[PDB]
DNA sequence: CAGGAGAAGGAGCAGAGCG
DNA sequence: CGCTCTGCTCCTTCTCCTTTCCTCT
RNA sequence: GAGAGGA
């Protein structure tokens, strides 16, 4: 499966849809969520 | 080996599809107690039932309470199992309400709860999706060699 | 209540059965019709039958195209393959009892267009080889040993009936359940 | 039933049958290797054995499964074959030499754990409650998942109304060839496509080439006497004369002219065309004789089904119907893989022998068995790699399947038991097709009607139920003789005119003959099956929409036991239960005495089944042993599952595998990649009759929490819980995570 | 009316499943008016008004004879005659091979003669006989069916399954100012682009209102404007 | 339903075949073809019972209760023979009908 | 036509014979039929169903 | 439920031995299906309304449906009284066998309790065929989401 | 492995003009 | 008056799409 | 790389 320049660009994980319109950003985390009524909205 | 404690945010199931997360861990005295001083280990919200129709879970609670009071393991099997009438008879023989709904005392105000509380043993199983393995944060670090992205 | 016996005779070598897929029984109550038959060709080691029935030219013969497209063809060729089928016995009634005889070969005869093949082969002229192909090879390598016909007979019936229960062959060690188990 | 035939019995029985029959079958298949030179030199594989050096009198010493798991080795047993090699002096001599190492399925007839009782297992660091049926390759537990597929050698007709097109394709599958013989309907005209012929051959021509050349017997084999069918089929009957009139030889020449199959040796076009009808058209039926009536009538019945679909739709058969599907276990897949590897090994060995013996002089024969031991690494390496990686690369069928083997899941006990007895759909994605992902009512008792990976495989992956036995190929030849005895005239003794006037009995998809009084024949055959004359898995049933008495004998059919009820009353008779409870009649004397019988999906069509004994009206012919066996091993965890809503049961079946708890008795002597353990597991209060049988009360995953169903503290709004401190402190939900780290101190070439 | 309907309107597909043409009658207070118009806008095959078809030879010629039963024509109150059926056959012979001569002998027994080479007459005549009882005699050859529906308050109108909007508007017995199909592209072809925009907006609003969801119509209008 | 219709048809076939056997007692050229289970269990008699019930036996006591094969017609079927590859193929005549027998329980 | 000739059973075909006379016969057979005009009708009675009248 | 079953049974026998007045749009079989579906829906609605009106004050499902916190009156009617018709793909359960849904009913049977009707509430407990039909509906929903 | 929708060549007729 | 280009219109056979990712292994 | 949770 040679990755032609066309393969590198096209596709869902290609440069346009995986690196240009939507990247991985720094200063971000991801964790489970739990409720907290005492916490005000916003 | 790593010994893990049920931290806040761990996932518990209820053997009926009532998966949930540990919302809060509260002290024993800040918990409802019955006439005998029993405090619940888990306080499941009552809103999980009316839209998911897990009547099997209510019957499981009643059968478990009646069996443990009678000192025997009750059977919940598809198309059969321990009938509700026998379990309610056992429950009323021991001095408990026929529907398994005890009358509790609020643990923070020390007065009666104005509604009888469904109270009994339910077999809860702890699932592997623990928050300790899912917390993840980044400020700076490794970047992809090709596109120089995280 | 009345006993209606039957006895099986010897093999008398092999007698075959011909089934004409085209010729039906008469629509009336008297299906006693049989076409004139002659020039029978047999083929052993491949079990081939070829039966020739001449046709009357006074009723729907089409004398022109028969010789224009083919040769002087006036008889349809019925070709057939004799398939073996055990347990098939032919029965006839001589006395109150019934006489059986093994068949061991049944053939369904269907029309064969030999003249079309001949016309095509005349018009065109101007290493295990396993499987049924090999059999087909035999079928078109050596064949067609000629044979005659005979309408009506009595010696076959006599040779089948002369058994006269001289060997009843009633000995049987097995029983109902044993035979059921050993089908 | 579970004592004599456990939950993990598909894998075990399939692998045992494989190692007992298919090894010798493949050996006798490729029993000879020849050469162009030296005609007095041949190798004859007299016999083959697994783990049995010669007589020996004892199975060879195998590494215990846990030792293989810890050392990252591969659990396997040697394969010893017999040798017959000649000599220039014409002397025949014998030898017994290893040819490779075949991996051994856990708890099979070859594994040491076979018949080990609580002491041998303890001494071998093996959990007594472990399911088995999985291989240990490279120290990893890999299980060959049961594969579901469409029934081979069976007619499946689908009416694509989207265009007005119907079809009659059959994926005839032999031990060497597998090809689809579609019978499409284009321009109101029936055709016959193929992967080996050019394009859309008319049906009348192929029927003439198959022997039925009368051109009127075609109308009596495809339409019978229905006026509404003859006009539909009259359109394509004139295509055997529109181009030109045809005879059998001419039709064979026409079909062979457009044959796309190539000839490696020169063959006549007519000769090849006959081949195209002899074997190429239908690999299932090989007509190695001078009469093609069986194949001709097979094509005629395909065309009859197509015309029936044309006259009125809704007479087609659903592909998703469970009776139309077969299950292939680990035994058959390993048979295929070993046959491919063995033929490659024989080819390589023959090439090496020819290379060594090519020398004109001093071509010594001594030590002719060196290259065999050189190549014996290749077979075992290929076998282990193909099992481990899950990519089954084959060349004889040009078949490539990926993901056959899965790593055995170790989260709970129920997870490891439910990964076993799992079925994977053949469909890749089935994006929008809501057909194979639906819950067909035909799977009642055959598949767990609640357990299914919720999500993107929600309907594709299914699991076997409790009462369920997968069939195996019993016989094919004796049943033909039994039918002929039973009173059906053969296929070469019935005229086409009367072929559709009475029921025709189809044996395993191919027409055998026509028999009057189908009910009497069915009853007598069922009585013979019940009394033990034939195998219990041979299923005979009656179809009335097309008058047929089908008999199915091939393996892979899903069967379940049911109590036979006579007129009005059952056959258990209340005294066989007493003997069963006493200790005799271990569910096998129940089959021998004809009290219970195995029904597959198709035979249930002809049956009337009672849910309980109190519902038996004097017309039903079967009784359910128990209605709670419609749920699999996982779904037996739920208490009172008949009161919940179905998605709740499905979610429980999904998330019960990922519940931490006790895993095995040797869970502390085990070094796995990731183990979750419960410090204080507790037996459930509200048990289930299923969980006693699968030993879930001995290795539970959970604790009996004193729940108070009440809105408290506000921190439990949406599915959130309120855990009680001072109970976590006393130990509640306390768990342990064990993770292994491996290190290999490789020796470099330097 | 689910997600697939929104997808069909969004993608502006040239063919949709189940296109419905609502047609309002000029006079709908009586079913007699509601059925005479219906027969004009249905694919009325010859087979329903042929009553038999035969193929008859002669000494040196052959033909196909079909006797139209006037009883069914009168009972179906169809507005067509023998000449209408003949001209319909001749004009719709586009699908067929050829047709130039039609004869009437008595009580509407139409005979079509085929005359020419070997076997051409027989094969051509057999094909013509097979393909004769399906030519659309009266109506629109783009309609699966048409059903009279009764609206509330006593009104009624005809719902048609097909793509003949222009013909349905043109045929008498209906009001052309109020007759609409589900197909957006058809409305675009027959009523300009503004009517296409109106149809897009109205159909999207109807699909998302029948499903009970509350989407503001201004977003729908913006989508229609973007599309058109 | 099916069982009653099958029994009625079997009785009709029993009486019909008894009439056929009585009628074909004349022996000009007519035959009849029987189908039997193989293996030759080892003759007997085609014993007719009261109310038109027909059954057969062999040397072993076995009552093969099966009577009446297909009533197939419009297929002219005749029987011939073969005599040692010499002048042979003597037409033994046609057959009237067919009988198939079957062991019962 | 949907007719089959005896001794051949193939489908009957109408052919333009000598002097343009339509003769009915089967190929591959020594069979013909001097045409009587074939006044025997190959009539197909189309299954028309019930109809309702309002006018 | 017995009254509804009696009406459906007489409708089935009328469709079998004789013919029923076909609706102006559908055919005979579709008319039968629509009529029995409508009758079952009506009886389920009536018994559900009876159950809801007979439910006492301070009832947790009743309060959670009145205030709208969770569920609705349909859910509590199914949990208490009955869960009538298990429609799959817009109609009753299809045929999983030859002219049948399950091998536990007579051939060519279209009466309720044989083609997807669950007269048992979740409290009472589902009969095996009712359980299978409800499982079919639930899996249909699960597959629909994905 | 299915489903949807365009672009590009054969292919079979109308239509026009004609010597 | 057939004959011979254009031109149009089918008809068939081809190509490019099918969430979110979020982990582990 | 591809096997499977997961929401
Ligand atoms: C047998 C095949 C049917 C189908 C492919 C053909 C046959 C008739 C065609 C419609 C009509 O032409 C009228 C409209 C014309 C507009 O411009 C585009 C839309 C429109 C509805 C068409 C769409 C499509 O093209 C149809 C349905
Ligand atoms: C045996 C005596 C000869 C003569 C009486 C038989 C033999 C061949 C028969 C004809 C063919 O079958 C073809 C046609 C079939 C149609 O259905 C009815 C007419 C049709 C012309 C037949 C008429 C008649 O029946 C014939 C002439
Ligand atoms: Zn002919």
Task: Report the 3 state secondary structure along chain C.
Answer: CCCCEEEECCCCCCCCEEEECCCCCCCCCCCCCCCCCEEEEEECCCCEEEEEEECCCCCCCCHHHHHHHCCCCCEEEEEEEEECCCCEEEEECCCCCEEEEECCCEEEEEEECHHHHHHHHHHHCCCCCCCHHHHHHHHCCCCCEEECCEECCCHHHHHHHCCCCCCCCCCCCCCHHHHHHCC
Q: Which residue has the tokens 């078109």?
A: C140
Residues H44 and D272: their CA atoms lie apart, in Å, by 68
Residues D394 and D341: their CA atoms lie apart, in Å, by 9
Q: Are H141 and H86 in contact (CB under 8 A)?
A: no
SS3 D290: coil
Phi-psi region of D547 (alpha: psi -120 to 50; beta: other; left: phi over 0): beta
Q: In what order do the strands lie in the sheet with D135-137?
A: D135-137, D140-144, D405-407
Q: Which chains touch E (3 or more CB pairs under 8 A)?
A: D, G, H
Angle at C177 between CA C173 and CA C183, to 5 degrees: 85
Residue E14 near ligand 1, beta carbon < 6 Å: yes
Residues D726 and D710: their CA atoms lie apart, in Å, by 19
Nearest CA-CA distance, residue D249 and chain G, Å: 14
DSSP assignment of chain B equals: -EEE---TT-EEE-SSS--EEEEEEE-STTS-B-TT----SB---GGGSTTT--HHHHHHHHHHHHHHHHTS-EE--TT-SS-HHHHHHHHHHTTS-TTSEE--B-TTT-SB-SS-EEEEEEEEEEBS--GGGT-EEESS----TTT---
Write down how long chain D is: 750
Strand partners for C108: C19
Write down how long chain G is: 55
User: Hey, what long-range contacts does H73-79 have (CB within 8 A, 24 or more apart)?
Assistant: H73/H48, H74/H48, H75/B50, H75/B51, H75/B53, H76/B50, H76/H51, H76/H52, H77/H47, H77/H48, H77/H51, H77/H52, H78/B53, H78/H48, H78/H121, H78/H122, H79/B50, H79/B53, H79/B55, H79/H121, H79/H122, H79/H123
Q: What are phi and psi of C119, to 5 degrees?
A: -65, -40
**Which of E9, E15, E20, E188 has most ligand 1 atoms within 8 Å of its beta carbon, as the pocket-test mutant?**
E15
Partner C contacted by G38 (CB < 8 A): no
Q: What is the DSSP letter of D468?
A: -
Residue D654 in tokens: 């999904």
Q: List the E94 CA – J6 C1' distance (angstroms).
A: 23
Q: Are D494 and D512 in contact (CB under 8 A)?
A: no
Residue E140 in tokens: 């629109």
Of residues E150, E162, E220, the one with CA closest to residue E186: E162
CA D735 to ligand 3 center in whole angstroms: 89
Residue D693 in tokens: 């049988």
SS3 content of chain E, % helix, strand, coil (to 5): 40, 25, 35
CA D235 to ligand 3 center in whole angstroms: 18
Residues D529 and D624: their CA atoms lie apart, in Å, by 19
Residues D609 and D601: their CA atoms lie apart, in Å, by 13
Question: What's the number of CA atoms in the CB half-sphere (13 Å) around residue D737?
Answer: 12
| Contact flag, residue D424 CB and nucleic strand K, below 7 A | yes
Query: Strand I-proximal residues, CB under 7 Å?
Result: D 427-429, 431-433; E 11, 13-15
Residue H37 in tokens: 């579906």
Beta strands in D601-730 (DSSP E): 609-610, 622-623, 674-678, 686-687, 703-709, 721-724
Residues G49 and E48: their CA atoms lie apart, in Å, by 8
- Collect all residues of chain C within an 8 Å Cβ-Cβ radius of residue D529: none
Residues E147 and D185: their CA atoms lie apart, in Å, by 32
Of residues D342, D341, D339, D345, the one with CA closest to residue D375: D345
Q: List the E98 CA – I11 C1' distance (angstroms).
A: 19
How many CB atoms neighbour CB H24 within 10 A? 10
Residues H89 and H92: their CA atoms lie apart, in Å, by 8
Tally the domains of chain F: 1
Take atom 3 of ligand 2 and give the residue whose Cα is closest. C59
Element (H, E) at D414: helix D413-419
Residues C179 and E93: their CA atoms lie apart, in Å, by 71
- Three-state secondary structure of D556-602: CCEEEEEEEECCCCECCCCCHHHHHHHCCCCCCHHHHCCCEEEEECC
Residue E15 near ligand 1, beta carbon < 6 Å: yes
Exposed, middle or buried: residue F50 (CB in 10 Å: 0-12, 13-18, 19+)? exposed
Element (H, E) at F90: strand F90-91
Residues F98 and F100: their CA atoms lie apart, in Å, by 7
Q: Has G20 been labeled as part of a binding site?
A: no
Q: Nearest residue to I5, CA vs C1'?
A: E13
Q: Are D272 and D263 in contact (CB under 8 A)?
A: yes
Residues D716 and D588: their CA atoms lie apart, in Å, by 54
The closest ligand to the CA of G13 turns out to be: 3
Q: Are B131 and B12 in contact (CB under 8 A)?
A: no
Partner H contacted by B115 (CB < 8 A): yes
Please state whether beta strands D622-623 and D558-564 pair in parallel, antiparallel, or not at all (unpaired).
Answer: antiparallel
Strand partners for D173: D178
- Cβ-proximal residues to H5 (8 Å cutoff; 6+ apart), any chain: H111, H112, H113
Element (H, E) at E55: strand E53-57
Residue G33 near ligand 2, beta carbon < 6 Å: yes
Residues C150 and C168: their CA atoms lie apart, in Å, by 32
Residue G10 near ligand 2, beta carbon < 6 Å: no
Residues E193 and C140: their CA atoms lie apart, in Å, by 76
Strand partners for D288: none
- Cβ-proximal residues to E9 (8 Å cutoff; 6+ apart), any chain: E184, E200, E203, E204, E207
- Give the distance between the most distant pair of CA atoms in chain F: 56
Of residues D325, D309, D297, the one with CA closest to residue D168: D309
SS3 content of chain D, % helix, strand, coil (to 5): 30, 20, 50
Partner F contacted by D283 (CB < 8 A): no
Task: Report the atom number in ligand 1 closest to the C-alpha of E166.
Answer: 13
Q: Which nucleotides of K are covered by protein (CB under 7 A)?
A: 1-7
Angle at E63 between CA E61 and CA E66, to 5 degrees: 160
Residue range of the domain that includes F24: 1-105
| Cross-chain Cβ contact E126/D238 below 8 Å | yes
Residues B47 and E27: their CA atoms lie apart, in Å, by 57
Q: Has G33 been labeled as part of a binding site?
A: no
Residue range of the domain that includes G7: 1-47
Residues D153 and D180: their CA atoms lie apart, in Å, by 10
Task: Report the atom number in ligand 2 closest to the C-alpha of G31.
Answer: 8
Please state whether beta strands D703-709 and B117-126 pair in parallel, antiparallel, or not at all (unpaired).
Answer: antiparallel
Residues D86 and D95: their CA atoms lie apart, in Å, by 12
Buried b / exposed e along C137-174 (16+ C-beta atoms within 10 A): eebeeeeeeebebeeeeeebeeebeeeeeeeeeeebeb
- Give the distance between the most distant pair of CA atoms in chain A: 56
Q: Which chains touch F (3 or more CB pairs under 8 A)?
A: C, D
Residues D469 and D14: their CA atoms lie apart, in Å, by 12
Q: Are E90 and E80 in contact (CB under 8 A)?
A: no
Q: Has G15 been labeled as part of a binding site?
A: no
Residues F39 and B88: their CA atoms lie apart, in Å, by 69
Residues E112 and C174: their CA atoms lie apart, in Å, by 76
Strand partners for F34: C89, F99
Of residues D644, D649, D654, the one with CA closest to residue D452: D654
Q: Which residue has the tokens 């097709």?
A: D433
- Cβ-proximal residues to D451 (8 Å cutoff; 6+ apart), any chain: D418, D462, D463, D631, D632, D634, D635, D650, D653, D654
| Contact flag, residue D364 CB and nucleic strand J, below 7 A | no
Q: What are phi and psi of D13, to 5 degrees?
A: -65, -40
Please state whether beta strands C48-54 and C75-83 pair in parallel, antiparallel, or not at all (unpaired).
Answer: antiparallel
How many CB atoms neighbour CB C14 within 10 A? 14
| Contact flag, residue A10 CB and nucleic strand J, below 7 A | yes
Residues B6 and B23: their CA atoms lie apart, in Å, by 11
CA E63 to ligand 3 center in whole angstroms: 23
C-alpha Rg value of chain H to the nearest Å? 17
Buried b / exposed e along H30-45 (16+ C-beta atoms within 10 A): ebbbebbbebbeebbe
Residues D713 and B31: their CA atoms lie apart, in Å, by 9
Q: How far is CA C48 from CA B42, D248, D249, D607, D722, in A?
A: 88, 15, 16, 47, 90
Task: Report the atom number in ligand 2 closest to the C-alpha of G33.
Answer: 21
CA C69 to ligand 2 center in whole angstroms: 24
Residue C21 in tokens: 């897929």
Nucleotide nearest to D406 (CA to C1'): K3
Residues H109 and H115: their CA atoms lie apart, in Å, by 8
Of residues B60, H133, H83, the one with CA closest to residue D638: B60
Please give the residue of chain G at the shortest CA–CA distance from D215: G10
Q: Which residue has the tokens 């007299």?
A: D46
- Collect all residues of chain E within an 8 Å Cβ-Cβ radius of residue H25: 147
- Cβ-proximal residues to G48 (8 Å cutoff; 6+ apart), any chain: E47, E48, E49, E50, E51, E69, E72
- Cβ-proximal residues to D693 (8 Å cutoff; 6+ apart), any chain: D2, D466, D636
Q: Are B68 and B121 in contact (CB under 8 A)?
A: yes
Of residues H31, H128, H47, the one with CA closest to residue H84: H47
The closest ligand to the CA of E21 turns out to be: 1
Angle at D578 between CA D575 and CA D582, to 5 degrees: 145
Element (H, E) at D371: helix D371-389
Q: Are D51 and D62 in contact (CB under 8 A)?
A: yes
Residue D226 in tokens: 């229905």
Partner C contacted by G19 (CB < 8 A): no
Q: How far is CA D117 from CA C147, D663, D680, in A?
A: 77, 19, 27
- Cβ-proximal residues to B48 (8 Å cutoff; 6+ apart), any chain: B18, B20, B54, D719
Q: Which residue has the tokens 């009886």?
A: H43
Q: How far is CA D620 from CA D525, D562, D600, D613, H103, in A?
A: 18, 12, 17, 11, 10
Q: How far is CA C65 from CA C114, C120, G31, G32, G36, in A?
A: 16, 16, 10, 10, 20
The dihedral sign for the CA sequence D423, D426, D432, D435: negative
Residues D599 and C19: their CA atoms lie apart, in Å, by 41
Beta strands in D315-364 (DSSP E): 325-328
Residues D685 and D708: their CA atoms lie apart, in Å, by 16
DSSP assignment of F42-82 equals: ---BEEEETTTEEEE--SSS--B---------SSEEEE---
Phi-psi region of D553 (alpha: psi -120 to 50; beta: other; left: phi over 0): alpha
Residues F105 and F62: their CA atoms lie apart, in Å, by 10
Q: Are D434 and D454 in contact (CB under 8 A)?
A: no
Q: Are E207 and E1 in contact (CB under 8 A)?
A: yes
Residue D182 in tokens: 């579609």
Q: List the D349 CA – I4 C1' distance (angstroms).
A: 53
SS3 F23: helix
Take atom 27 of ligand 1 and give the residue whose Cα is closest. E15
Q: How far is CA D569 from CA D595, D605, E94, in A?
A: 12, 21, 69
Tally the domains of chain G: 1
Residues D468 and D445: their CA atoms lie apart, in Å, by 7
Say if G38 falls within a structural domain. Answer: yes
Angle at D493 between CA D488 and CA D499, to 5 degrees: 75
Residues D505 and D518: their CA atoms lie apart, in Å, by 8
Q: How far is CA D341 from CA D33, D96, D136, D380, in A?
A: 15, 20, 20, 9
| Cross-chain Cβ contact D703/B56 below 8 Å | no
Q: How far is CA E167 from CA D498, E25, E139, E173, in A?
A: 53, 14, 9, 12
Q: Are D240 and D248 in contact (CB under 8 A)?
A: no
Residues D353 and D368: their CA atoms lie apart, in Å, by 8
Q: List the B114 CA – J17 C1' distance (angstroms).
A: 60
Resolution in Å equals 3.2
Residues D246 and D210: their CA atoms lie apart, in Å, by 12
Please state whether beta strands D422-424 and D201-202 pair in parallel, antiparallel, or not at all (unpaired).
Answer: unpaired
**In chain H, where does DSSP find H-type helix?**
2-17, 28-54, 60-66, 73-80, 128-145
Cα D101 to chain center, whole Å? 25
Residues D520 and D503: their CA atoms lie apart, in Å, by 12
SS3 E209: helix
Residue E38 near ligand 1, beta carbon < 6 Å: no
Among B9, B131, B138, the residue with its CB nearest the CB of A29 is B138
Say if G53 falls within a structural domain. Answer: no
SS3 D488: coil
Q: Nearest residue to K6, CA vs C1'?
A: B129
| Method used to determine the 3D structure | cryo-EM
Say if G54 falls within a structural domain. Answer: no
How many CB atoms neighbour CB D726 within 10 A? 15
Residues D612 and D422: their CA atoms lie apart, in Å, by 29
């Amino acid at each position: 499966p040679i990755r032609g320049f066309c393969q590198r660009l096209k596709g869902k994980q290609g440069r346009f849809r995986g690196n240009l319109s939507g990247k991985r950003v720094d200063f971000s985390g991801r964790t489970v969520i739990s409720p907290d009524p005492n916490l005000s909205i916003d | 080996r790593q010994n893990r404690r049920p931290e806040l945010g761990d996932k518990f199931s209820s053997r009926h599809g009532q998966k949930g997360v540990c919302g809060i861990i509260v002290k024993q005295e800040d918990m409802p107690f019955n006439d005998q001083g029993i405090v619940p280990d888990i306080i499941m919200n009552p809103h999980g039932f009316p839209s998911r129709m897990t009547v099997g879970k209510m019957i499981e609670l009643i059968s478990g309470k009646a069996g443990v009071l009678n000192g025997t393991l009750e059977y919940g099997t598809c198309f059969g199992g321990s009938k509700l009438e026998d379990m309610s008879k056992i429950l009323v023989d021991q001095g408990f309400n026929y529907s398994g709904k005890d009358m509790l005392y609020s643990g923070i105000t020390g007065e009666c709860l104005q509604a009888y509380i469904f109270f009994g043993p339910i077999y809860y199983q702890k699932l592997k999706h623990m928050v300790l393995d899912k917390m993840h944060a980044r400020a700076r670090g490794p970047r992809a060699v090709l596109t120089r992205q995280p | 209540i009345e006993e209606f016996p039957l006895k099986i005779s010897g093999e008398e070598e092999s007698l075959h059965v011909f089934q004409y897929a085209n010729r039906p029984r008469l629509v009336g109550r008297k299906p006693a019709e049989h076409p004139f038959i002659s020039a029978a060709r047999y083929k052993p080691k491949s079990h081939l039958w070829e039966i020739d029935i001449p046709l009357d030219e006074q009723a729907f013969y089409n004398k022109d195209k028969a010789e224009s497209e083919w040769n002087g063809v006036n008889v349809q060729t019925l070709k057939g393959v004799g398939v073996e089928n055990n347990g098939q016995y032919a029965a006839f009634v001589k006395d109150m009892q019934v006489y059986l005889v093994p068949i061991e070969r049944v053939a369904q005869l269907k029309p064969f267009f030999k003249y079309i093949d001949d016309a095509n082969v005349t018009r065109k002229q101007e290493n295990r080889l396993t499987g049924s192909l090999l059999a087909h090879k035999v079928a078109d390598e050596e064949a067609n040993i000629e044979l005659t016909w005979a309408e009506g007979t009595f010696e076959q019936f006599k040779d089948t009936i002369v058994k006269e229960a001289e060997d009843k062959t009633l000995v049987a060690l097995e029983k109902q359940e044993d035979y059921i188990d050993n089908l | 039933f579970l004592k004599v035939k456990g939950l993990v019995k598909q894998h075990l029985d399939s692998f045992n049958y494989f190692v007992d029959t298919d090894l010798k079958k493949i050996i006798k298949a490729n029993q000879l290797i020849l050469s162009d030179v030296d005609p007095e030199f041949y190798l004859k594989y007299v016999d083959i054995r697994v783990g049995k050096k010669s007589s020996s009198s004892t199975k060879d010493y195998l590494t215990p499964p846990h030792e293989c798991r810890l050392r990252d080795m591969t659990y396997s047993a040697p394969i010893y074959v017999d040798i017959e090699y000649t000599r220039g002096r014409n002397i025949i001599m014998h030898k017994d030499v290893e040819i490779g190492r075949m991996p051994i399925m856990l708890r099979s007839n070859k594994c040491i754990l076979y018949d080990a009782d609580e002491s041998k297992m303890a001494k071998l660091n093996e959990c007594p409650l472990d399911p088995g049926g999985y291989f240990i390759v490279n120290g990893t537990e890999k299980v060959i998942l049961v594969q579901e597929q469409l029934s081979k050698n069976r007619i499946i007709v689908e009416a694509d109304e989207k265009k007005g097109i119907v079809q009659a394709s059959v994926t005839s599958s032999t031990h060497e060839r597998k090809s689809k013989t579609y019978v499409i309907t284009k321009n109101g005209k029936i055709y016959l496509k193929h992967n080996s012929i050019a394009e859309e051959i008319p049906i009348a021509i192929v029927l003439k080439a198959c022997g039925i050349l009368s051109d009127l017997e075609i109308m009596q084999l495809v339409c019978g006497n229905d006026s509404s069918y003859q006009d539909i089929f009259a359109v394509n009957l004139e295509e055997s004369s529109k181009l030109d009139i045809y005879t059998q030889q001419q039709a064979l020449e026409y079909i062979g002219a457009k044959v796309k199959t190539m000839r490696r040796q020169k063959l006549t076009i007519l000769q090849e065309g006959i081949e195209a009808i002899a074997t190429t058209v239908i690999a299932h039926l090989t007509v190695e004789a001078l009469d093609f009536r069986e194949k001709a009538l097979y094509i005629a019945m395909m065309t009859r089904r197509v015309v029936m679909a044309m006259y009125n739709p809704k007479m087609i058969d659903d592909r998703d119907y469970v009776g139309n599907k077969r299950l292939e276990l680990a035994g058959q897949l390993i048979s295929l893989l070993f046959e491919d590897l063995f033929k490659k090994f024989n080819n390589d060995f023959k090439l090496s022998i020819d290379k060594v013996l090519k020398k004109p002089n001093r071509a010594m024969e001594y030590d002719a068995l060196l290259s065999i031991n050189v190549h014996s690494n290749n077979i075992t390496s290929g076998l282990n790699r193909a099992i481990s990686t899950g990519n089954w690369s084959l060349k004889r069928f040009k078949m490539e399947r990926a993901g056959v083997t899965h790593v055995l899941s170790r989260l709970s006990y129920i997870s490891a038991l439910g990964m076993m007895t799992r079925i994977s759909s053949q469909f890749e994605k089935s994006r929008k097709v809501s057909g194979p992902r639906a819950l067909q009512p035909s799977q009642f008792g055959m598949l767990c009607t609640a357990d299914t990976p919720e999500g993107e495989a929600c309907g594709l992956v299914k699991n076997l139920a409790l009462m369920t036995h997968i069939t195996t190929d019993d016989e094919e030849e004796p049943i033909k003789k039994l039918c002929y005895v039973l009173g059906v005239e053969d296929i070469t003794l019935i005229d086409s005119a009367s072929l559709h006037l009475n029921y025709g009995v189809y044996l395993n998809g191919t027409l055998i003959g026509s028999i009057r009084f189908p009910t009497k024949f069915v009853t007598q055959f069922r009585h013979l099956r019940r009394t033990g004359k034939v195998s219990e898995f041979i299923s005979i049933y009656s179809n009335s929409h097309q008058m047929a008495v089908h008999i199915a004998t091939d393996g892979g059919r899903i069967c379940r036991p049911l109590i036979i009820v006579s007129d009005g009353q059952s056959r258990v008779k209340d005294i066989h239960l007493r003997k069963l409870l006493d200790g005799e009649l271990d569910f096998d004397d129940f089959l021998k005495l004809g009290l219970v019988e195995y029904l597959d999906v198709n035979e249930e069509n002809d049956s009337y089944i009672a849910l309980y004994e109190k519902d038996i009206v004097p017309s039903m012919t079967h009784l359910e042993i128990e209605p709670f066996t419609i749920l699999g091993a996982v779904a037996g965890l739920i208490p009172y599952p008949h009161h919940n809503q179905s998605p709740r049961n499905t979610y429980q079946c999904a998330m019960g595998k990922q519940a931490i708890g006790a895993i095995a008795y040797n869970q502390f002597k085990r070094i796995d990649t990731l183990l979750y353990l419960m410090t204080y597991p507790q037996q459930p209060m509200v048990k289930t009759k299923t969980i006693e049988l699968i030993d879930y009360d001995k290795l539970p995953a959970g604790q009996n929490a004193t729940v108070a169903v009440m809105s408290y503290s506000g921190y439990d709004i949406e599915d959130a819980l309120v855990l009680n401190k001072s109970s976590i402190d006393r130990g509640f939900g306390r768990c342990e995570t064990r993770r292994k780290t491996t290190t290999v101190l490789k020796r470099y070439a330097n | 009316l689910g997600v697939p309907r929104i997808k069909e309107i969004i993608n502006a597909s040239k063919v949709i499943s189940t296109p419905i043409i609502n047609a309002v009658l000029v006079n709908d207070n009586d079913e007699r008016a509601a059925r005479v118009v219906k027969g004009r806008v249905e694919k009325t095959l010859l087979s329903d008004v042929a009553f038999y078809v035969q193929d008859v030879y002669k000494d040196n010629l052959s033909f196909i004879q079909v006797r139209i039963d006037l009883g069914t024509i009168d009972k179906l109150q169809l507005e067509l005659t023998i000449e209408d059926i003949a001209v319909a056959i001749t004009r719709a012979s586009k699908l067929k091979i050829q047709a130039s001569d039609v004869n009437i002998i008595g009580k509407d027994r139409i005979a079509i003669n085929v005359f020419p080479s070997e076997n051409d007459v027989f094969y051509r005549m057999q094909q013509l006989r097979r393909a004769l009882p399906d030519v659309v005699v009266k109506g629109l050859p783009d309609i699966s069916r048409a059903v009279i529906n009764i609206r509330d308050d006593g009104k009624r109108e005809l719902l048609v399954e097909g793509y003949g909007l222009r013909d349905v508007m043109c045929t008498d017995g209906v009001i052309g100012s109020r007759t609409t199909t589900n197909h957006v592209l058809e409305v675009f072809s027959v009523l300009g682009i503004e009517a296409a925009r109106y149809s897009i907006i109205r159909e999207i609003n109807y699909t998302m209102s029948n499903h009970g969801m509350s989407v503001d119509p201004r977003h729908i209008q913006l989508l229609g404007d973007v599309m058109t | 339903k099916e069982a009653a219709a099958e029994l009625e048809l079997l009785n009709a076939d029993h009486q019909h075949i008894l009439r056929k056997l009585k009628k074909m007692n004349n022996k000009p050229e007519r035959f009849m073809v029987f189908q039997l289970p193989t293996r030759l269990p080892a003759v007997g008699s085609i014993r007719v019972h009261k109310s038109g019930k027909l059954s057969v036996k062999i040397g072993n006591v076995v009552m093969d209760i099966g009577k009446g094969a297909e009533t197939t017609f419009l297929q002219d079927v005749i029987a011939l023979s073969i005599a040692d590859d010499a002048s042979s193929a003597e037409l033994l005549g046609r057959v009237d009908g067919k009988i198939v027998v079957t062991p019962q329980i | 036509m949907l007719s089959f000739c005896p001794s051949c059973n193939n489908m009957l075909l109408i052919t333009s014979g000598d002097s343009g006379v339509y003769t009915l016969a089967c190929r591959s057979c020594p069979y013909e039929f001097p045409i009587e005009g074939i006044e025997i009708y190959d009539r197909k009675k189309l299954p028309r169903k019930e109809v309702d009248d309002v006018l | 439920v017995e009254i509804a079953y009696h009406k459906c049974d007489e409708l089935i026998t009328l469709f079998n031995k004789g013919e029923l007045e076909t609706q102006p749009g559908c055919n005979e079989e579709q008319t039968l299906e629509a009529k029995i579906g409508g009758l079952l829906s009506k009886v389920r609605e009536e018994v559900g309304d009876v159950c809801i009106n007979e439910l006492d004050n301070w009832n947790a499902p009743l309060i959670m449906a009145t205030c709208g916190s969770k569920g609705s009156t349909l859910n509590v009617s199914q949990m208490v009284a009955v869960v009538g018709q298990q429609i799959i793909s817009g109609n009753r359960v299809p045929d999983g066998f030859q002219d049948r849904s399950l091998p536990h009913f007579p051939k060519n049977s279209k009466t309720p309790q044989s083609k997807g009707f669950v007269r048992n509430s979740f409290f009472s407990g589902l009969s095996p065929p009712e359980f299978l039909f409800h499982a079919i509906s639930g899996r249909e929903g699960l597959v629909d989401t994905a």
